[PDB]
């Protein structure tokens, strides 16, 4: 499916996992974390996925290490061979 981060909307690292686990669909135990994130990626999502990340940088700001990291594990999981279009705005 298709995903989209609209930093102006992100409040927190929370709100970030929020639009994604809408985006992915995450169960309602979404970890939140990158280590839940991922364990979706790897085995949840289903891919190709796009990962839309609109105001990039704006929903790391806010939650220092926030954005770059939720990223961080979309480029990751991409390269562990599923198709995560990831889409840097």
Known sequence: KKAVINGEQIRSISDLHQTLKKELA???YYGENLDALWDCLTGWVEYPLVLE???????????????????QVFREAKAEGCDITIILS
Do not use: D, H, I, M
């Open 53 to 71: 990340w609109r105001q990039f940088e704006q929903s790391k700001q806010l939650t220092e290490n926030g954005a770059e990291s939720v990223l």
């Open 26 to 28: 995450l169960p309602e």
